[PDB]
Design an enzyme around this catalytic site. Sequence first.
Site, short mmCIF file in Angstrom:
data_model
loop_
_atom_site.label_atom_id
_atom_site.label_comp_id
_atom_site.label_asym_id
_atom_site.label_seq_id
_atom_site.Cartn_x
_atom_site.Cartn_y
_atom_site.Cartn_z
N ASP A 97 0.81 -1.20 0.00
CA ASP A 97 0.00 0.00 0.00
C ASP A 97 0.85 1.26 0.00
OD1 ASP A 97 -2.80 0.03 -0.29
OD2 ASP A 97 -3.00 -1.07 1.59
N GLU A 182 -17.61 4.70 3.42
CA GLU A 182 -18.92 4.20 2.99
C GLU A 182 -19.72 3.67 4.16
OE1 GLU A 182 -16.95 1.50 0.23
OE2 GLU A 182 -17.34 2.87 -1.32
N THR A 338 -20.77 4.85 -5.09
CA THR A 338 -19.38 4.70 -5.50
C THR A 338 -19.03 3.72 -6.60
OG1 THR A 338 -18.90 3.11 -3.82
CG2 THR A 338 -18.70 5.41 -3.07
N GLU A 376 -19.38 7.84 -8.19
CA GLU A 376 -17.99 7.76 -8.55
C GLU A 376 -17.75 6.48 -9.34
OE1 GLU A 376 -16.07 7.47 -4.77
OE2 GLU A 376 -16.74 9.41 -4.14
N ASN A 377 -16.66 6.43 -10.08
CA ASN A 377 -16.27 5.17 -10.66
C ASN A 377 -15.53 4.50 -9.53
OD1 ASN A 377 -14.26 7.42 -11.30
ND2 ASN A 377 -12.91 5.71 -11.76
N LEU A 379 -13.11 1.88 -9.97
CA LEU A 379 -11.74 1.55 -10.26
C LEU A 379 -11.28 2.48 -11.36
CD1 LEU A 379 -11.88 -2.38 -10.09
CD2 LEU A 379 -10.47 -1.05 -8.70
O1 LIG Z 1 -7.02 -0.89 -2.97
C1 LIG Z 1 -7.86 -1.65 -3.82
C2 LIG Z 1 -8.91 -0.75 -4.52
O2 LIG Z 1 -9.79 -0.24 -3.51
C3 LIG Z 1 -10.88 0.51 -3.99
O3 LIG Z 1 -11.66 -0.31 -4.89
C4 LIG Z 1 -12.83 -1.00 -4.42
C5 LIG Z 1 -13.90 -0.78 -5.51
O4 LIG Z 1 -14.26 0.59 -5.58
C6 LIG Z 1 -15.13 -1.64 -5.20
O5 LIG Z 1 -16.12 -1.51 -6.22
C7 LIG Z 1 -14.68 -3.08 -5.08
O6 LIG Z 1 -14.09 -3.43 -6.33
C8 LIG Z 1 -14.24 -4.74 -6.83
C9 LIG Z 1 -14.87 -4.51 -8.19
O7 LIG Z 1 -16.12 -3.85 -8.02
C10 LIG Z 1 -15.01 -5.85 -8.89
O8 LIG Z 1 -15.45 -5.67 -10.22
C11 LIG Z 1 -13.65 -6.58 -8.90
O9 LIG Z 1 -12.75 -5.92 -9.74
C12 LIG Z 1 -11.96 -6.70 -10.65
C13 LIG Z 1 -11.86 -5.78 -11.83
O10 LIG Z 1 -13.15 -5.62 -12.40
C14 LIG Z 1 -10.86 -6.33 -12.83
O11 LIG Z 1 -10.69 -5.41 -13.90
C15 LIG Z 1 -9.53 -6.56 -12.14
O12 LIG Z 1 -9.11 -5.29 -11.65
C16 LIG Z 1 -7.78 -4.83 -11.88
C17 LIG Z 1 -7.93 -3.32 -12.13
O13 LIG Z 1 -8.70 -3.04 -13.31
C18 LIG Z 1 -6.53 -2.74 -12.22
O14 LIG Z 1 -6.58 -1.35 -12.41
C19 LIG Z 1 -5.80 -3.05 -10.93
O15 LIG Z 1 -6.56 -2.49 -9.86
C20 LIG Z 1 -5.91 -1.75 -8.85
C21 LIG Z 1 -6.35 -0.30 -9.04
O16 LIG Z 1 -5.87 0.15 -10.29
C22 LIG Z 1 -5.83 0.60 -7.90
O17 LIG Z 1 -6.38 1.91 -7.96
C23 LIG Z 1 -6.24 -0.06 -6.58
O18 LIG Z 1 -7.69 -0.03 -6.49
C24 LIG Z 1 -8.34 0.45 -5.31
C25 LIG Z 1 -9.45 1.36 -5.86
O19 LIG Z 1 -8.86 2.49 -6.48
C26 LIG Z 1 -10.43 1.73 -4.75
O20 LIG Z 1 -11.60 2.31 -5.32
O21 LIG Z 1 -5.81 -1.44 -6.51
C27 LIG Z 1 -6.33 -2.32 -7.52
C28 LIG Z 1 -5.81 -3.76 -7.28
O22 LIG Z 1 -4.47 -3.89 -7.71
O23 LIG Z 1 -5.71 -4.44 -10.70
C29 LIG Z 1 -6.95 -5.13 -10.65
C30 LIG Z 1 -6.59 -6.60 -10.49
O24 LIG Z 1 -5.57 -6.74 -9.52
O25 LIG Z 1 -9.67 -7.45 -11.05
C31 LIG Z 1 -10.58 -7.04 -10.02
C32 LIG Z 1 -10.60 -8.20 -8.99
O26 LIG Z 1 -9.29 -8.47 -8.53
O27 LIG Z 1 -13.04 -6.66 -7.64
C33 LIG Z 1 -12.87 -5.43 -6.95
C34 LIG Z 1 -12.21 -5.77 -5.63
O28 LIG Z 1 -11.09 -6.61 -5.88
O29 LIG Z 1 -13.69 -3.24 -4.06
C35 LIG Z 1 -12.49 -2.48 -4.24
C36 LIG Z 1 -11.57 -2.84 -3.07
O30 LIG Z 1 -12.05 -2.29 -1.86
#
Ligand SMILES: OC[C@H]1O[C@@H]2O[C@H]3[C@H](O)[C@@H](O)[C@@H](O[C@H]4[C@H](O)[C@@H](O)[C@@H](O[C@H]5[C@H](O)[C@@H](O)[C@@H](O[C@H]6[C@H](O)[C@@H](O)[C@@H](O[C@H]7[C@H](O)[C@@H](O)[C@@H](O[C@H]1[C@H](O)[C@H]2O)O[C@@H]7CO)O[C@@H]6CO)O[C@@H]5CO)O[C@@H]4CO)O[C@@H]3CO
EC number: 3.2.1.2
Length: 491
Positions: A97, A182, A338, A376-377, A379
């Site tokens: 982290d 949240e 979110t 919000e988006n 990811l």
């Molecule tokens: O610190 C982790 C993360 O925390 C926060 O994200 C939340 C998110 O907002 C919630 O909705 C939930 O997320 C779920 C998704 O909803 C669910 O679909 C699934 O996601 C999968 C993706 O769909 C798939 O594409 C892939 O994800 C990739 C991702 O596209 C990459 O960009 C990379 O992700 C990293 C982010 O780029 C980085 O910002 C950070 O993310 C935060 C996020 O900003 C915050 O809002 O870390 C991630 C992880 O490295 O990599 C991933 C793959 O590793 O795979 C995922 C499943 O693995 O799952 C997520 C939860 O896993 O929960 C998160 C977590 O609290």
Amino acid sequence: SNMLLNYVPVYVMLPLGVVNVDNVFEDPDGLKEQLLQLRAAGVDGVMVDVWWGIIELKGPKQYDWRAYRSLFQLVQECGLTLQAIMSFHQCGGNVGDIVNIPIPQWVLDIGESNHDIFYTNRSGTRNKEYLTVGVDNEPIFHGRTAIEIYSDYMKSFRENMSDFLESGLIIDIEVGLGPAGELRYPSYPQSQGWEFPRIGEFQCYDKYLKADFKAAVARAGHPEWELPDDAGKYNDVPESTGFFKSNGTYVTEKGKFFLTWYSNKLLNHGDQILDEANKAFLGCKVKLAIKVSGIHWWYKVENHAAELTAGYYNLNDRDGYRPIARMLSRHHAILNFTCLEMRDSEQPSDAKSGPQELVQQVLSGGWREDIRVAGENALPRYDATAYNQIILNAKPQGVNNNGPPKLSMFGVTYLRLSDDLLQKSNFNIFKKFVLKMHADQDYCANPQKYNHAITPLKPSAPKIPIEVLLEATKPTLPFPWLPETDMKVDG
Ligand SMILES: OC[C@H]1O[C@@H]2O[C@H]3[C@H](O)[C@@H](O)[C@@H](O[C@H]4[C@H](O)[C@@H](O)[C@@H](O[C@H]5[C@H](O)[C@@H](O)[C@@H](O[C@H]6[C@H](O)[C@@H](O)[C@@H](O[C@H]7[C@H](O)[C@@H](O)[C@@H](O[C@H]1[C@H](O)[C@H]2O)O[C@@H]7CO)O[C@@H]6CO)O[C@@H]5CO)O[C@@H]4CO)O[C@@H]3CO
């Protein structure tokens, strides 16, 4: 009439840790360049976490607002508005982290002798990200209750930032209500091994919430009822568990009683602290907001497991989001949802994920209860297909050439300002997403032109009894979505 009545503002989250754990705003110059890039692109404002753990670090009511004053000073000079989050939670802490910001060390020291102030799963693991709703009205933090700690922080924020408040820099105050700000239980903790798409675990095993449940079931006439012992583990699938399988415990009288108690704990948590937030910001020209998580996995099976463990008691015949929108209406608050960019087709099929219909259900619930909905988006995304999904949700029935749309979101905050966003080809696509959000109008510095004027925050309307809140569990049909935006960023 005007295409400008169609304008939905765009905000950008600032880098995590822009002022650090030591309460230092590290690099005004670097942020400054980035913020001026954002201002040229047409971005209306930015969003930043105001970390409880940096500001009240040294001791009870030992606040230092100086590094955040400097940050709000620079934002105002760059011509941007601000969304402030009262972040009473931990940032980061697990493997690799970027930033790790805990809650006040003085609170952490209390938790060394009373571990039951943290959320606890069945196994006895303490999640230190946020104080359990069980201690909300317990006077154990040097004579204060956890809601009085949150209330005092917000009152000091109002007094020490009153010139930014009086000058209209701050557009809304988002008040953090759980993990990641949240309103929910920490049911899917990455740090405890959880991995998508797993159902998560219930977080009601601290001694305060367990003692509360047992008194309640004794009064409902079943003193012998216990907390779930058959719901499984973080990474299960629902049919693998006694609680979430077909005709399992969730459908039982005991399970429905538990699920109503568990999700109701969050409604009253949300309503009491927002009672405090309205007192602290009374008379200021600011809107109140809370964040609700988008837990789309297992949304397409009957048990909606991941939502239920998170505290959102949402089944196909029980709306568990519109009671939250109803509670928000007496505080005149905004529901910030979110998750706004995902498509079902992007999901692994075995997750039984319904992102697009979860959004249509949460936003239709809010507009039906006549509150403002923002989002919000979830990811980081830089591609047009994410951006065109945010724009469809922002205005579900398109542009109304003749007036205001019947349905539109109040704002959208894009997750994170990063060097990647600013990369040349990525930033040119973000510029077009901003334009289309603005319905093809240039940025408009004065919100009143597009019917977003902010008024002094009125006092909260009277308490809505939980039986009138839970009337909003009646399922309703969502408003219709256009299959695709009529204002595409164009792939
Ligand atoms: O610190 C982790 C993360 O925390 C926060 O994200 C939340 C998110 O907002 C919630 O909705 C939930 O997320 C779920 C998704 O909803 C669910 O679909 C699934 O996601 C999968 C993706 O769909 C798939 O594409 C892939 O994800 C990739 C991702 O596209 C990459 O960009 C990379 O992700 C990293 C982010 O780029 C980085 O910002 C950070 O993310 C935060 C996020 O900003 C915050 O809002 O870390 C991630 C992880 O490295 O990599 C991933 C793959 O590793 O795979 C995922 C499943 O693995 O799952 C997520 C939860 O896993 O929960 C998160 C977590 O609290």
